[PDB]
A paper describes a structure:
Lenacapavir (LEN) is a long-acting, highly potent HIV-1 capsid (CA) inhibitor. The evolution of viral variants under the genetic pressure of LEN identified Q67H, N74D, and Q67H/N74D CA substitutions as the main resistance associated mutations (RAMs). Here, we determined high-resolution structures of CA hexamers containing these RAMs in the absence and presence of LEN. High-resolution co-crystal structures of LEN in a complex with cross-linked CA hexamers revealed that the inhibitor binds in a hydrophobic pocket formed by two adjacent CA subunits.
To elucidate the structural basis for how the N74D CA change confers resistance to LEN, we have determined the X-ray crystal structures of cross-linked CA(N74D) hexamers in the absence and presence of LEN at 1.97 and 3.32 Å resolutions, respectively. The overall secondary structures of CA(N74D) and CA(N74D) + LEN are highly similar to those of their WT counterparts. Yet, the structure of the N74D mutant protein has not been reported previously. Here, we present X-ray crystal structures of CA hexamers containing the N74D substitution in the presence and absence of LEN, which reveal structural bases for both LEN resistance and deleterious effects of this CA substitution on CPSF6 and SEC24C binding. Asp74 can interact with the N61 of LEN via a water molecule, though these indirect inhibitor-protein contacts are likely to be substantially weaker than the direct hydrogen bonding between Asn74 and the sulfonamide group, as seen in the CA(WT) + LEN structure. Second, the N74D substitution results in a significantly more negative surface potential at this site, and its vicinity to the LEN binding site could adversely influence inhibitor binding (compare panels C and D in Fig. 3). Asp74 interacts with Lys70 in unliganded CA(Q67H/N74D) but not in the CA(N74D) structure. Superimposition of our apo CA(N74D) structure with the FG-motif containing peptides of CPSF6 and SEC24C bound cross-linked WT CA hexamers helps us to better understand how the N74D change compromises CA binding to these cellular proteins. In addition, the CA substitution would introduce electrostatic repulsions between the side chain oxygen of Asp74 and the main chain carbonyl oxygen of the Leu315 of CPSF6 or the Leu230 of SEC24C. Accordingly, the N74D change impairs CA binding to both CPSF6 and SEC24C.
Numbering used by the authors:
A (entry chain A), C (entry chain A), F (entry chain A): 1 to 86, 91 to 219
B (entry chain B), D (entry chain B), E (entry chain B): 1 to 86, 93 to 219
The structure:
């Protein structure tokens, strides 16, 4: 990554063994459960494109996912090139999409862009592309559709709501989209005894109020 | 977070793998037992709003709780906006800026390291902990009225259950100290209750626990 | 905690994940065995009152103990207020007992007292109160009285002495008090075959000499 | 390794216990699965040739692989020597100097921190990774031609096996993207193959995986 | 401990959780096996007397041993006092000051960082290690005279037991090297003893172990 | 160890708990398998003689080995004394063999030699002696001779080669010595079906070529 030294300059630092292992382990244990994405983002704080490729490439298995991600990255890189078409001796060159993705750029080139004044934040740009690709994989690999999340006849309302919002989260539902699904489905698919209670609360009931009423 | 480096300057630092994993593991093992809140607060020492959202978002499962929390945050942001309406100069934070959803990391650092600081990390953390406390209370399984000492239950074990329940119900510290002379005695088993009655008013918890040992 | 930076000033530092987990784990594993107190003291090196409350509050369970500790702290805070009764714009205010205990003072107020010249060491004062309370809990929760520690007919003298001084330690026995109990009980409650041997050594026998003689 | 300290200077640092153990554990658990190579590269960030030899030498077992690697290193050193023939002044590195067997740590630091640097650590690492890639390929157990979707095998699981095998066989990224329209369809089971045929040319992998879900 | 910071100054640092846990775990797993002493010494690198008492006091159990240690410390403190009788100026340490029971941390730092230093941490550690060595010897279960090679016991295994026992009995290094020609042969089984006799005097341990392999 | 500070001076640093435990654990788990030596060397980076003795002395068990190592060290120290026979107030004294081995020298004496201009690298000299002794122990404790490594009738050629070069490594075989053993034994002791294949490749076949041909 790039970190700040004591002088106040942004300098390169090796990716740590703890960072490397943490990312490998979370994929091993959680695959593409939705909470892996914020973990990838946090573990890749300050990452160069090289560091981002290191993290992706240290994943063994899930190679269908990793190949889909490459295809998403190539699409995003192709769009970058469409909007930013691109040498003076000793001067900074403009990055291509594949430079941002770390496959045609050197580490020192990446550092130069990231620490430039103003910076070309190739690490942040690449990370956005990766997360776009990971979000498609999370959505693709969700085992449940929200329409099939119905409360069981003896299922605690709390457990049903957990499934409902887990499923919705895997869908990358906006707050707009998440609120539409709740309004359309949450009460309507609660079990009969809980459903009558929630209707009395009205459309303005908070989730907290609904969960208290059906406990 | 924003921490002071070894030279005296306040600088941004990445959240560490250790911090990230500690928070995930605490929720996995303890869910929303009350002691998870002080752990969240300490693990988020110096957090920017971005760091706080990272910690919340790295939790898998418990999405009913996480959605209630989001709703609490939105209420607090709306109250912030009600009290604080809004080249190269610094903008005032709205509620969604404090909550990290409409503000950038560099903007959050700008507010936090401003002179004087706008401590958006601390403000957001207060909102989050307000929401976590409501979750703790909702997921508290027992009322203090149903914690009664079993006929052969050691008084120490009963007192442990009583004050565990009280903490999850989030009785004030005053009610915790006051229940020592009222409800704690009333729900003791007959043999110990007779002993506690003889102690008279004003017995400390230590004195009650010694007397029913 | 408060640590020294490279300039030589005492500055605040976040409590570490390793510190936080170490304290939680030792209570989980050892409860109020006597050696937990020196571990609490060492893990709270340089702690602010806020850090001390964090450590106590991260304990789940043992809430009888934690409530007894609160009562001890309130007593000590009440005595502080009795001896130190207590605003100029921009100036340091004198701490109340509840300020030392971290419930009515801010972190920046605590730092100001701790780093003042001369310091008001509110962290050290509060820690003393906590350890006073923990010592009462260790003593209360000891399963054995020293009068019931007698050497078994086939028990190795070493194992008996281990039980004897474990029990005495839980009692918070002074060195004065610890020596009186040894003189009163250790030989007198050794088993007959070992007891005759130790009497011959006389009252000046070291423990080492007694343990060698009864092996 | 050679890293920049908190003041801006490039200095030698001991390889850490954490780095040492991570590398040993990765080989123990994964042997020469392809993802071990990027892990070796990152764990050897900033390595001197001495550090690289330390990491290789701390591996127990797999000595057939380690001997093949030594032979690959010797070939690369010979090609280096073919292209680069050789008081108080700095000497030029031979292949065995780059590989750390005839050069001292202080000489390696001298080359790496020279202006301009002779990056013997990076050169040696390239040779090593060339040798590790040959080991990965040799120890690849299956040909891509034998990865065929089972009649009830989920298409996702088959695609995982297909691209795992392709990676171990070290098909180029072009061949990986090209096989999506050719071999991946051909080795699908009849039911999914009919679906993929109807998709027409140009289907992305995501589109194929959705279609056979 | 007192350590030098990254700038060159000797400063106090808190004992770390890692150090604290390592010491507790070593005693839990190994009790007073002889190799625990060098581990205690290294883990207490730079320790103040306060740190040394922390490490000793964090041990649970083994209180017979800990009481013997206290008695040894008191003897050493008394000998110190016998040899060293005692506004804003520095006071001389008594034995109980060196042992950390009557001195404050700031006083201990004052002595240790004085010019010239009064190294109370090192002095106390010597006393402690003197006491730990006596505990190691007392808890040594076997005499070297009872370590004899079994009729089918590999000579290497017998030599391991012999020198483990010798270390716990704390034979000098001279006696360890001298026993190679005397007791080690005498307690070997008949078949190996005949071989060792033929080797003649002056055989190294390596030569004896090869000969009885 | 001795590490560089920010000024650029070589200063003493305490050996770390992680270093201490790593060395103890690798001996517990691996004994004197050949790869333990490079681990000892790496874990003792920058070590003083005191640190080297700490590492050796924290090993419990294997005391036959540890005593052999002492004998090797004493031999090397005796040779040092033979080549370097050895006080001015406040001046550096020349180290004896036992000073290099850390038994007659203080830590501050060792630091003075190691950080002198020019340095007397007593830590590096001692480490060489220790590794010489450990190499003799690795060789002594190898369970197999290379002459007994023959390929099984159903054993994969890869597994046979692994055993062959493991055994050779434990022998401390040079590259010269290692190549002579391969030329003498590797094909000659391959099983019949694999042996005919390798002979056709000729004496210039790489190992890679031999392993491909017999898979
Ligand atoms: Cl690390
Ligand atoms: Cl994210
Ligand atoms: Cl790769
Ligand atoms: Cl690169
Ligand atoms: Cl840009
Ligand atoms: Cl609920
Ligand atoms: Cl970390
Ligand atoms: Cl809190
Ligand atoms: Cl998220
Ligand atoms: Cl953000
Ligand atoms: Cl404000
Ligand atoms: Cl009790
Ligand atoms: Cl930590
Ligand atoms: Cl204490
Ligand atoms: Cl709390
Ligand atoms: Cl506070
Ligand atoms: Cl005061
Ligand atoms: Cl004994
Ligand atoms: Cl480390
Ligand atoms: Cl790579
Ligand atoms: Cl090696
Ligand atoms: Cl070297
Ligand atoms: Cl070059
Ligand atoms: Cl799919
Ligand atoms: Cl630590
Ligand atoms: Cl020692
Ligand atoms: Cl204690
Ligand atoms: Cl003290
Ligand atoms: Cl002195
Ligand atoms: Cl042997
Ligand atoms: Cl450490
Ligand atoms: Cl080596
Ligand atoms: Cl020792
Ligand atoms: Cl020493
Ligand atoms: Cl020399
Ligand atoms: Cl093969």
């Amino acid at each position: 990554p790039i970190v700040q030294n004591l002088q106040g300059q942004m300098v390169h630092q090796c990716i740590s063994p703890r960072t490397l292992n943490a990312w490998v382990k979370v994929v091993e244990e959680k695959a593409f459960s939705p909470e892996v994405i914020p973990m990838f983002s946090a573990l890749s704080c300050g990452a160069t494109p090289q560091d981002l490729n290191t993290m992706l490439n240290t994943v063994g298995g899930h190679q269908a996912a990793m190949q889909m991600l490459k295809e998403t990255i190539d699409e995003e890189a192709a769009e970058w090139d469409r909007l930013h078409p691109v040498i003076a001796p000793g001067q900074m060159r403009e990055p291509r999409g594949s430079d941002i993705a770390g496959t045609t750029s050197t580490l020192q080139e990446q550092i130069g862009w990231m620490t430039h004044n103003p910076p070309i934040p190739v690490g942040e740009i690449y990370k956005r592309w990766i997360i776009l690709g990971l979000n498609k994989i999370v959505r693709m690999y969700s085992p449940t559709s929200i329409l099939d999340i119905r409360q069981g006849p003896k299922e605690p309302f709390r457990d049903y709501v957990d499934r409902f919002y887990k499923t919705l989260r895997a869908e990358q539902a906006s707050q707009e989209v998440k609120n539409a699904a709740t309004e359309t489905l949450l009460v309507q698919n609660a079990n009969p005894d809980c459903k009558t209670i929630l209707k009395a609360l009205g459309p303005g009931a908070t989730l907290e109020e609904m969960m208290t009423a059906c406990q």
